[PDB]
Design a protein around this ligand. Sequence first.
Ligand SMILES: Nc1ncnc2c1ncn2[C@@H]1O[C@H](COP(=O)(O)OP(=O)(O)OP(O)(O)=S)[C@@H](O)[C@H]1O
Ligand SMILES: Nc1ncnc2c1ncn2[C@@H]1O[C@H](COP(=O)(O)OP(=O)(O)OP(O)(O)=S)[C@@H](O)[C@H]1O
Ligand SMILES: [Co+2]
Ligand SMILES: [Mg+2]
Ligand SMILES: [Mg+2]
Lengths: 371, 374, 68, 53
Amino acid sequence: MFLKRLDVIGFKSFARISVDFVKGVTAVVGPNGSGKSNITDAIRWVLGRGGMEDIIFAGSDSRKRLNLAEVTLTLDNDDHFLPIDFHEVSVTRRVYRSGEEFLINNQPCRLKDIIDLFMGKAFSIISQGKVEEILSSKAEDRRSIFEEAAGVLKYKTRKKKAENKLFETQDNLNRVEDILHELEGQVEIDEFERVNERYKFLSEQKEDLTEAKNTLFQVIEEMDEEMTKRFNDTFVQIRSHFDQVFRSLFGGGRAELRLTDPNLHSGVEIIAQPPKKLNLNLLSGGERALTAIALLFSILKVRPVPFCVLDQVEAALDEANVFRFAQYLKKYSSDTQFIVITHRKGTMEEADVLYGVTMQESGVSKVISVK
Amino acid sequence: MFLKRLDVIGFKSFAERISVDFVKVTAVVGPNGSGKSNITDAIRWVLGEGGKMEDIIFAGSDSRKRLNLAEVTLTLDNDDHFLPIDFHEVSVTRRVYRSGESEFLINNQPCRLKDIIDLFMDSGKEAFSIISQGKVEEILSSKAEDRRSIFEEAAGVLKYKTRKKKAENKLFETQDNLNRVEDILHELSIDEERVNERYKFLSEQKEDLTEAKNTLFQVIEEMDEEMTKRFNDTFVQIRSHFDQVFRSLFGGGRAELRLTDPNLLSGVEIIAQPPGKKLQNLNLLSGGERALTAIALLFSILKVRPVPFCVLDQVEAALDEANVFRFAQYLKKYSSDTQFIVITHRKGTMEEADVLYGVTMQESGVSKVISVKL
Amino acid sequence: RQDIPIEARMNEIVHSLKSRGTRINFMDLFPYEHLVVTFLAVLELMKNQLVLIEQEHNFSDIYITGSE
Amino acid sequence: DIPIEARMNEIVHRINFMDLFPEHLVVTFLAVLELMKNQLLIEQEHNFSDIYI
Ligand SMILES: Nc1ncnc2c1ncn2[C@@H]1O[C@H](COP(=O)(O)OP(=O)(O)OP(O)(O)=S)[C@@H](O)[C@H]1O
Ligand SMILES: Nc1ncnc2c1ncn2[C@@H]1O[C@H](COP(=O)(O)OP(=O)(O)OP(O)(O)=S)[C@@H](O)[C@H]1O
Ligand SMILES: [Co+2]
Ligand SMILES: [Mg+2]
Ligand SMILES: [Mg+2]
């Protein structure tokens, strides 16, 4: 998915603006109140501050509340990273003041259409200060951040649906059993040959389930063999980059990342020791920052996502380590597209693109860009 | 209480004995891993509240040792006798010994647990005059009925609260008493009835003393009338400071503060509508809108009940390249009637600061302190 | 500084509209790192309703017009 | 980064932190605060006194 442009009308501060995401780093700069954090919430409401209609502009002087809010995203599918043949994909979402919608390539589509299509930019986007969201989270609730990075969620969800189907199959064999137990006594004019006229074919009719279900269980069992294997294959490839990024950020600092128990549900537990045994709760505001940051740039070394957005991920670290979260953002500009929203100039120096967001015209945000 | 200096030994990152000299703005620099936002953990430790209590002592870096004795000091100029003590150089220290034993010391004499509280109850070094890290917006996100008390200790009305509470207990106990003795007063040839003269002597005098504690206690309970009056006097005094401070942070702002119902005991609600926006909620403010507004509300308090020394853990963390410099200006215009401790990585406030104590960390997991003036 | 160019540019951008009326051209207002801060200031004054800028499309030459 | 090493080599040709100064003294100190964190020293009599490298 190569990011091409982003059009907005009615979405929060969005007054009908288009963003042409260039190749490399795009710094989303500006002062406070501009609504650049909306540029991440729209890349939420299109893929999948309110509560519903809170998504729509409501109230500003020199303007009036709108009734319909929509956003478009234009993706270059030349290499067919998407299950379509289009070379310009355009996804749009919208909400009406009445509470009522999404389009794929200028055509309407179902609810789970865009969801099924992207299967993907969660931890792919880092909103304000949510960085530490990785560390503080429990170990049992941390592996999720890996399961998406390992693609295991596809095979997983499918397999869940398939078990749900097996439940209904058993729910049918239940009644079929009692019926047949009645047929044994009903067995022993020629109209009684009408009762045995349903049981003999209902034998291969219930057996039809008694076979298809057996063809489903195997389709679950070895389907986990492609999930439970992929989870490890990724986990270790992130392991061998934890030390690399971490240490490259802390000269002489060595750390690691381990897990607990088999897998399924394996709580991934995180360890770090700057250049000094640092429970990681005792790490500095920066030390808590450049951990979930290094861990990111190790994930971005395994399954790097093309569209990755970060919202003020560097406002907790001294200018010495802002250069760290700058250069590790100036390398991966080639392999993936990074959109970061940080007013700290340190990253704004290496940023290939500068998209300044302000607010004129009262509570209405305009956009400028130079580079 | 003009701040003088602070000595730490064995406290957290602080391994070698080091101290800091404070002036009348002091910006605490230093790159991450260091101890600047630790020094504030020590400043709250001195007066009052890592995991448990052991994690307060220097755990030790495996380039040095493992200390088991931690203690912090604080020296203040009480020339104007800000506190109920007659000393003109006050030294307050708290100690933590790996035996699990904490100590308290002032000058030449050990101190009690719930003692150093009282010395400071009138001053309000308020722990809420300490702005924490990742807490700068705490008051803005916190529930109304969780933002009421910050004004209570702002107005100083806490001491009265402790008064009326204890008095309440006393009046309860005495009520139980008089009730119980009224049952004794109700339970009560020829020869000599001489014990009844004492029975009516153990009531008409005794119920006189107890019943003299009634009318005398409920007048000290009516001293809460002073506590509520002084509170609301301040509740209103902050009011007309908001907008004017806001409007000078957001050119053309409009904001105001207001309460819910009547029945101290209520809750407070903030309202903020920046210039050329309005019509919205608090949750719909920007990332640095909540930062500045909270800043205004915790910068206007100090225009009503100012304190000696306040603490800033990364207050301008999420803010513009300009709304910090304006925050720096304000730090300079308020640095007169109170001493300021700020922890900031951006040059903006550093330029408007008097003397910086930059915290390094040499010798592995050990913090060092270097100071420079302007 | 950051605040200093905010109002130091307010002379050359208000007096250019009083001399030729022509909007201050960011391509012309180029001082010299510097192209970041100098853009950040103009990309600030828009919230004070002190300056307006137009773009026929993105990435096009930007012109600063201070007034409102 | 550049101001943080432009005085690093200049420390091998000992003197006060003010001997490395000409307004920007702030940043200059901020760099010395990192180099200390990289083990590359700092001497002072007491608080806010003469600081020798
Ligand atoms: N749904 C909305 N409806 C109307 N105005 C909105 C809406 N969302 C945001 N705004 C306006 O923009 C302001 C805050 O929007 P945010 O998106 O949170 O800004 P922000 O992106 O977080 O700003 P920064 O600088 O990035 S920290 C409000 O004060 C409003 O004036
Ligand atoms: N109790 C402790 N025992 C030993 N080391 C500690 C202790 N507390 C903190 N440290 C060390 O100090 C580091 C973090 O201390 P913090 O006080 O949070 O840092 P900080 O003050 O936030 O630093 P900055 O630059 O001011 S953000 C850890 O890496 C530890 O090595
Ligand atoms: Co093709
Ligand atoms: Mg934001
Ligand atoms: Mg800190």
